[PDB]
Amino acid sequence: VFALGNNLGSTDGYLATHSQIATKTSKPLLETSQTVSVITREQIDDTASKTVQQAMRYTPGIFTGQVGASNRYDYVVMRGFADNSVDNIYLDGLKAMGDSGTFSSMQVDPYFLERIDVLKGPSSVLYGRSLPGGLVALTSKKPLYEDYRQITGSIGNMGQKEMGFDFSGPLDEEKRIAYRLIGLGKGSDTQFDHVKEERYAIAPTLAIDFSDDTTLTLQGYLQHDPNGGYHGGVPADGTLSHHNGRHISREFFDGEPSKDDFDRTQRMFGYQLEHRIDDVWSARQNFRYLDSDVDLSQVYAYGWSASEPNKLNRYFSGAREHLQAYIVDNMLQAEFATGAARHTLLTGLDYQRRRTVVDWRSGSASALDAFNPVYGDDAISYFPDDNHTRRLEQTGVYLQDLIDIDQWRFSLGLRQDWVSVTDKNRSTGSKADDDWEKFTGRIGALYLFDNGLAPYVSYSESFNPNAYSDASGTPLAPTEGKQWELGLKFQAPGSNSFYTASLFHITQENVASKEPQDNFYTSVGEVRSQGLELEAHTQLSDNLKLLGSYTYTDITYTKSLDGNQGHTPNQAPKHMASLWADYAFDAGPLSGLSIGGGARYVGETWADKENTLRVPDYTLVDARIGYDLGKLGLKGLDVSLNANNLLDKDYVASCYSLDFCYFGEKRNVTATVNYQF
Ligand SMILES: CCCCCCCCO[C@@H]1O[C@H](CO)[C@@H](O)[C@H](O)[C@H]1O
Ligand SMILES: CCCCCCCCO[C@@H]1O[C@H](CO)[C@@H](O)[C@H](O)[C@H]1O
Ligand SMILES: [N+]
Ligand code: NA
Description:
Name: Ferrioxamine receptor FoxA
Strand content: over 45%
Number of domains: 2
Assembly: monomeric
Bound molecules: octyl beta-D-glucopyranoside, ammonium ion, sodium ion
Helix content: under 10%
Distance between the termini: 28 Å
Oligomer: monomer
PDB class: membrane protein
Keywords: TonB-dependent transporter Siderophore, membrane protein
Largest sheet: 22 strands, antiparallel, barrel
Shape: globular
Number of helices: 3
Entry title: Crystal structure of ferrioxamine transporter FoxA
């Protein structure tokens, strides 16, 4: 079997045994000196997680509430790092290649995924530019070598509707060629008035074995979102407190007129080539091209009107964006012994090239009453247009040696990146340009006791281009993450249970900062995140599956020029916890029935960086019920019922500032039918 670039991990219920996210080569979770979580297909289905972001709500060290109920983008806040949270997603070993300085961030639909792997903390040594919180790797469904056919249909509240199919199998007598074809159409009204979500997608994959030494997998992914749900927010003033009227803004309130529009087309093609040279030497090339179009028209609230008392001031954003992106990763691995030491030595060259053409519009809109709005006044007073061509190039050369000797498992990593970023202002003709090089490193040591207890330590580094620029308008120095991590993992042999504790201390340097009167940003800011994560997978009964998590996060601006030094970032709960359980009857009359549910806790959050107002804590409840009607003599047919936020709590999930607060999703009920053959 082929380790390089594959997880190759067994999965049973909600627990995987192996990953490649931390190493680019199959490694037991138990023998990996980093915090790795895995969210299985079964967990996604059982919790009715409708997006990647929602799939993470049972994982420690992840906050799922950055823009509350919005499903437009996947925001995964890791270890309290909210900034550039959209850019944490990798798909099939490759950076998604969205542009986080634009509206062109992509979304991968969960129905195409086999599993979600989550790596905590700085991880640039294998991936290049990334955030200090970690990163998420989506693994797409791959061709099967036995015929597999699934049709599925879902119906819910809020006008939810989905149909999908998933067909796979061999094409030849010899079973050397196999396909998979997955398609999907879906819709929702949301909780919000006048809002639609809508998506049509298809993903063909073909896998071909040339010999026992070579597999090529060809992949396409075409997705059209002609509607983009809701992506707004409203003041703390009337959400966290009553405003004037003694009113609160409703969880269904819509701040825009029907001059609203979000149209996203994503067109991806790629391949994965796996080649065994020797029992020692293996090589792999992962490639993906992306081409997307985004069209946006959005009127949004921004603060209360100075003159008109229960009306919100509004503005308009308009965008027409075309994103092109190439990414390739070239890996060569040698597995070999030198005396008592076994080496798994990886060398790699990767390359990212991105161009985003953006035509931006903006203006002033009419004011809107925040209770009993009257739509139809959609005239916009337009400000100056703002058109850009943005380019990024990243070349990475990296080395890694995993050294296993006796019960020790060591990891040594080094990477050099050459980065070039350009911004051509097509309105003004001016061009900002920037080229630099960064070295990142990682060192891990883990001791595997033969009882399945594994203490470890890790030092790991990250960088990311700075989103801010100086006086001159050449960008600041890239931010930098540095983490010391101490952990303990434990799995009792055979028992399908797995427990981890992780302690972390992350420093992020060269963060943009200024005096508030000041014009120039300088790269003198610093952020420190430290804490504890606990994760438990317990499979008792063989009919009973449990997940539990606890997260403690202490994050602070340790150096700031703006008066917020020593404050806690907003959108950063100190305390979170979760628990999910699922029971299946094999035994009795009830064979085929399954019942499940859980609870999620988010602690209090600051609504603002100035730390003047709290978002209250909240506990949410989820539940499910499933039946295999196979058991009653009609095979491959099963149904499920899910309710997330079962008590229908009406709450603010988080705030970006005092002006922008986001409601959590109201009760979401779905009924699903799955038909195999
Ligand atoms: C069980 C709950 C189902 C309610 C679905 C929410 C849909 C509310 O929003 C709908 O959006 C349309 C688009 O402009 C409007 O024209 C409709 O009048 C409005 O009902
Ligand atoms: C879990 C242990 C964390 C110890 C480091 C915290 C002290 C401040 O931060 C440290 O500053 C040092 C420079 O003085 C650097 O060498 C370290 O990489 C950095 O983490
Ligand atoms: N504005
Ligand atoms: Na399957």
